[PDB]
Design a protein around this ligand. Structure first.
Ligand SMILES: Cn1c(=O)n(C2CCOCC2)c2c3cc(-c4cccnc4)ccc3ncc21
Length: 802
């Protein structure tokens, strides 16, 4: 009756929030309760007119390469209604001024040109100008905002030393327990139990007295229990709870097994109980509830020493002297926003006094607030190394400066960063709740970015599910309708992918596929595309649908577009795959999209193709089909072969000369990008190219060479084992490489988090690849040398690949 809505949300999320069986406290229920207010606040504050039409706009400057297309200076936008007419408009002209009521929707898209924004500052206008396409719009009627209607004793006096009683470890099928007090990645104090023979049950009943006191336990503290026999099981328990109270009583904790990592920081217990390892522990209880309460300059030499510490890379660890230097002169270090991550590492979190000294130091934020926004440091303070609620919130406060365009560039990386938050309700989760609820595009990607983890991560599904339910409860009836239509389709397409895979390691398979898709089309008739929400896919082209030939078996699906106002009847091609982890490809594609923005600021377009890719469920998702594209393997199935393929598929010579240029930029782009990320040693079948000349890597799901610059690519430029194109390539390569190096800290910390949340020494790769330390001229030469490593090898490495 009154519960029907929750069972609808339950099916959208893919996990039950009301079901509380793997919970030892009430944090999820308390954060479900606490999340109501920032949803109520956002639902109410959003302009219902601009919420319904979600104009995807930017406040960033129009790039160098895009002002080349505009001349007079005017742009042509063709308005449709059967009868169409072109209108010459100034780049700085508002959409209403063009209209001279009615709205300017994009043809075949739920994309609109609205608000007090210049047309040059629209993401669809910039997109068309980049791709050299016409701006086809339609004089449509604004959508009803009615469709989005939303349904409605003190701690610092407990000077006693802390202790935990290790009762034992009950397991269904030598060993010792390692008890740790943790804050960030920094272990405060360790204690082990005496080794005992490994059996079905191992009792100890011994108390482990720690060096740290109750008073000195920081908000965010963790009792991390580990089972060593060398590490085999782990579990965590927040010593300070959500209601600021120290943990008391008996706790049985089901432990996570093994095979550093974000999964190893989780406060959640293992849901499996009949097969998992447990741990009975006792925590000292009291009659009254224990509750946590709330100059000189610097000499020229010690200034230079501190300046060198700030200027180093994030991965560079601080010594004991570096930590003392930074802490003593914290008031100076506070006047340099770049020192904050390193300074907040230098503080002794296991000392109530040193913590209180930081908390009051942070009240002098006049300098941090007034600073120019840096995503680098903001992401730095949100990682595993920072467990303090206050420090993290200073980073979340800067995320408010980010306009909807930028929130989209880091939505996935911010969603992952929630894994490092000690408590469920956090400034970050709330931040992602505001931005998702304010914007429909952000909200759509939020849904899928959260649903990605809820369905595959047993470690963080609990936390993420309460954040999804909170977003869902405020998006409005329209988005809730759209998501049911997406869930219903992917859940339908999930069975088909799995049933077909359970028939192969042919005509039988291809007939059985259409035999199943037939009893599927007879709901829904339309659904938004999870990786491109503007595009609405209609009914299937069941005759075009096939099962793909590789080691894995994906579903090549083609859907007609639901919008009849579309320019072409070109179907929407979607790959539905199983057995591969799309969570890592999502992460790689995101850094690629970030790299492009870095190049945009530096006035460069390296023509990357970061194809839509959404992780949907348990090792299953969907991938965008790139139209008129094939792999290098299919083009070979040597030197001449690619340039012969480009001319052959090219209509005019004008278009071919465009095809070789689109090749040099995209090739240089994938050369710099895949090198930095360390995914350049890839097989020919994992490198694609459009009939337009647009090259792009794929299958990112986890002798040597730095990148792929084979002779067939070189022959396209006009070189065999210099050229006017190869010189243009080398120059744009360096120009692109040096741009990414200006954002070292950003890339370093983006990669670091990517590793921990998606997948110590492995991370160190970007230090060397982004040539940390070396000057602008030394890096130019270093990259040009890596070009020559590909020239020397040629077909060697490509041949080596089995
Ligand atoms: C025409 N055509 C293909 O043949 N294929 C492939 C199918 C699987 O064998 C490799 C080639 C693709 C595409 C494959 C991906 C992709 C698939 C899995 C992982 N990462 C990326 C993306 C876009 C694509 N577009 C077009 C297209």
């Amino acid at each position: 009756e009154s519960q029907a809505f929750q069972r609808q949300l339950t099916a959208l999320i893919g996990y039950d929030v009301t079901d509380v069986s793997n919970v030892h406290d009430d944090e999820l229920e308390f954060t479900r309760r606490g999340l109501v207010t920032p949803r109520m606040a956002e639902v109410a504050s959003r302009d219902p007119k601009l919420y319904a039409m979600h104009p995807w706009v930017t406040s960033k400057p129009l790039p160098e390469y895009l002002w080349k297309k505009i001349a007079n200076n005017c742009i042509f936008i063709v308005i449709h209604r059967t009868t169409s007419q072109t209108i010459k408009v100034s780049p700085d002209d508002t959409p209403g001024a063009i209209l001279q009521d009615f709205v300017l929707r994009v043809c075949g898209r739920d994309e609109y040109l609205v608000g007090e924004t210049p047309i040059k500052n629209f993401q669809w206008v910039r997109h068309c100008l980049k791709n050299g396409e016409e701006i086809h719009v339609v004089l449509d009627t604004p959508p009803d905002p009615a469709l989005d209607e939303v349904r409605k004793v003190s701690l610092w006096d407990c000077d006693r030393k802390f202790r935990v009683k290790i009762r034992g470890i009950d397991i269904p099928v030598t060993v010792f327990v390692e008890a740790n007090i943790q804050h960030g990645q920094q272990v405060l104090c360790q204690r082990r139990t005496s080794p005992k023979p490994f059996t079905e049950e191992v009792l100890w009943n011994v108390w482990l007295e720690f060096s740290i006191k109750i008073k000195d336990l920081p908000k965010g503290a963790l009792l991390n229990l580990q089972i060593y026999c060398q590490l085999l099981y782990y579990v965590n328990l927040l010593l300070i709870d959500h209601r600021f109270l120290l943990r008391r009583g008996e706790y049985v904790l089901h432990m996570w097994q093994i095979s550093f990592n974000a999964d190893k920081l989780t406060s959640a217990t293992n849901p499996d109980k009949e097969n998992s390892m447990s741990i009975s522990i006792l925590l000292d209880n009291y009659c009254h509830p224990i509750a946590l309460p709330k100059r000189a300059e610097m000499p020229n030499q010690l200034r230079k020493q501190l300046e060198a510490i700030i200027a180093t890379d994030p991965l560079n660890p601080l010594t004991a002297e570096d930590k003392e230097l930074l802490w003593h002169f914290r008031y100076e270090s506070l006047k340099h926003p770049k020192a904050y991550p390193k300074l907040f590492s230098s503080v002794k979190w296991g000392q109530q006094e040193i913590v209180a000294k930081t908390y009051q130091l942070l009240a002098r934020r006049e300098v941090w607030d007034q600073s120019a926004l840096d995503v680098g440091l903001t992401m730095q303070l949100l990682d595993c190394n920072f467990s303090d609620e206050n420090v993290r919130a200073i980073a979340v406060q800067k995320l408010e400066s980010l306009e909807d365009d930028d929130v989209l560039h880091y939505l996935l990386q911010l969603v992952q960063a929630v894994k490092f938050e000690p408590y469920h309700d956090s400034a970050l989760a709330r931040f992602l709740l505001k931005r998702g609820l304010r914007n429909k595009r952000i909200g759509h990607f939020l849904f899928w970015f959260l649903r990605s983890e809820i369905a595959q991560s047993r470690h963080y599904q609990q936390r993420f599910a309460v954040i999804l339910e909170a977003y869902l409860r405020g998006c409005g009836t329209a988005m809730l309708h759209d998501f049911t239509q997406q869930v219903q389709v992917i859940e339908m397409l999930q069975k088909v992918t799995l049933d077909i895979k359970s028939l192969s390691a042919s005509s039988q398979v291809i007939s059985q596929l259409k035999q199943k898709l037939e009893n599927l089309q007879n709901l829904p008739e339309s659904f938004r595309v999870p990786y491109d929400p503007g595009l609405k896919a209609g009914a299937l082209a069941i005759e075009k649908c096939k099962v793909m030939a590789s080691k894995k078996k994906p579903l090549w699906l083609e859907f007609k577009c639901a919008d009849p106002t579309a320019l072409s009847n070109e179907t929407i091609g979607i790959i539905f795959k199983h057995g591969d982890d799309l969570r890592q490809d999502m992460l790689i594609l995101q850094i690629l999209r970030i790299m492009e923005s870095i190049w945009e600021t530096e006035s460069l377009d390296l023509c990357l193709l970061p194809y839509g890719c959404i992780s949907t469920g348990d090792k299953i998702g969907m991938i965008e089909i790139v139209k008129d594209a094939t792999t290098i393997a299919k083009i070979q199935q040597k030197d001449e072969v690619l340039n012969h393929w480009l001319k052959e598929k090219s209509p005019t010579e004008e278009k071919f000369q465009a095809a070789v240029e689109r090749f040099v930029y995209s090739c240089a782009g994938y050369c710099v990008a895949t090198f930095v990320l360390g995914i350049g040693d890839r097989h020919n079948d994992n490198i694609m190219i459009t009939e337009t000349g647009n090259l792009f890597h794929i299958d990112f799901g986890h002798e040597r060479v730095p990148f792929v610059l084979t002779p067939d690519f070189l022959f396209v430029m006009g070189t065999s084992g210099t050229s006017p194109h190869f010189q243009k390539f080398q120059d744009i390569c360096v120009k692109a490489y040096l741009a990414l190096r200006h954002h070292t800290n950003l890339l370093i910390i983006l990669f670091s988090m990517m590793l921990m949340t998606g997948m110590k020494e492995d991370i160190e790769y970007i230090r060397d690849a982004l040539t940390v330390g070396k000057n602008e001229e030394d890096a130019k030469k270093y990259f040009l040398d890596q070009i020559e490593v590909c020239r020397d090898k040629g077909w060697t490495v490509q041949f080596n690949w089995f």
